[PDB]
Amino acid sequence: KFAEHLSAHITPEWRKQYIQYEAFKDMLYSAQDQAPSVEVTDEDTVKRYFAKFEEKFFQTCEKELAKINTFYSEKLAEAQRRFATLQNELQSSGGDLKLAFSEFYLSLILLQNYQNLNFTGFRKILKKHDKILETSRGADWRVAHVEVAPFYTCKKINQLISETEAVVTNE
């Protein structure tokens, strides 16, 4: 179950910045929980019900995506400045930095796991949505919004990871 996996692999200091996967699941339960029956109501009532829900669901996806994009960017900026600082310390003095560079590297990897966990959570939640509502709107949303999101498409952390490896190896 991805809700458990996500819980176990969140970086605790970043907890509130991850996709709120369990809240989405609950919302997708509520969509079925409040759904009128076409036999008791009619066709227009039911599909108008689902239309309101879809507006709410994808507005919530957008807020979660903006939060994740914003946090990813902030940690990426912080990592760029942290690399420059460690660059001068080595560019002048030439075992403390072997530890300090190792901990910066760990920080890059933790951010990389943050990218992957959030993408998987989005991918799984939108597939769950599509199977429940018998629609492809969630998959279409993933392609048009998540897969072109900076938190996911930006390659500057990969660049940092490579450059830090080149510093640790050649210095």
From Swiss-Prot:
<feature type="region of interest" description="Important for inositol polyphosphate binding">
    <location>
        <begin position="124"/>
        <end position="131"/>
    </location>
</feature>
<feature type="topological domain" description="Cytoplasmic">
    <location>
        <begin position="1"/>
        <end position="171"/>
    </location>
</feature>
<comment type="similarity">
    <text>Belongs to the SYG1 (TC 2.A.94) family.</text>
</comment>
<protein>
    <recommendedName>
        <fullName>Solute carrier family 53 member 1</fullName>
    </recommendedName>
</protein>
<feature type="domain" description="SPX">
    <location>
        <begin position="1"/>
        <end position="171"/>
    </location>
</feature>
<comment type="subunit">
    <text>Homodimer.</text>
</comment>
<comment type="function">
    <text>Inorganic ion transporter that mediates phosphate ion export across plasma membrane. Plays a major role in phosphate homeostasis, preventing intracellular phosphate accumulation and possible calcium phosphate precipitation, ultimately preserving calcium signaling. Binds inositol hexakisphosphate (Ins6P) and similar inositol polyphosphates, such as 5-diphospho-inositol pentakisphosphate (5-InsP7), which are important intracellular signaling molecules involved in regulation of phosphate flux.</text>
</comment>
